[PDB]
Every structure is written in C-alpha cells, then in structure tokens.
C-alpha cells in the first residue's frame, strides 16, 4: 500500500465526482409511500 499513488488518486477523484453527479441527479428523490398511490408526505397518512 505504498506503490499505489497516481492511480488511486485518479480513482478516488472519480468516486467523488460521480458522488456529486449522483447528488445532483437523485437529491431528495429516494422517498416513497407504503402503498404506491400517495406521492407526497402529506398524502401518506392514515391506513390502507
């Protein structure tokens, strides 16, 4: 773990960059309701 510098650097830069692209694409979009009828948090109240 001492002869991997330039390559790991390129790789950890990649991971980070993709993480950012992911945050820009899926930020606040991984929420859902129990019954996939309600699309809002206000909607998913009560019982089904």
């Amino acid at each position: 773990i001492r002869t991997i510098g330039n390559i790991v650097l390129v790789t950890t830069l990649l991971q980070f960059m993709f993480a950012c692209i992911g945050v820009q694409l899926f930020k606040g979009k991984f929420f859902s309701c129990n019954d996939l009828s309600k699309m809002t948090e206000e909607e998913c109240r009560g019982y089904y």
Partner: protein, 50 residues
C-alpha cells in the same frame, strides 16, 4: 363513529377534536343512541384530517 369511546385513549389527531357522548338506550332503534349530535362515518382507506 368507529372509534374507541374509552375516555383514557385521547388520540387527538391534528385538525380534529372528538366527542365523548352519553348514549341512552332506545326503542325504535335497537341500539344505544345520542340525540344531541350526529355521528360521522369516514370510510377506512380515506384519511380524516385531509
């Protein structure tokens, strides 16, 4: 209607406030009834408080 009438429950959903009524027993209705107000039936999959 269709809610526990036990006083110690106290669910108190937002927007709404319930009534504990007194429920005399009756004839012409073969069930206990209250003549001071009307009950409300909400169906089950419908949320109340919407």
């Amino acid at each position: 209607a269709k809610d526990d009438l036990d006083p110690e429950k106290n669910d108190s959903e937002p927007g709404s406030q319930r009534i504990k009524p007194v429920f005399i027993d009756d004839a012409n209705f073969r069930r206990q009834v209250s003549y001071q107000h009307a009950a409300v039936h909400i169906p089950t999959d419908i949320y109340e408080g919407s």
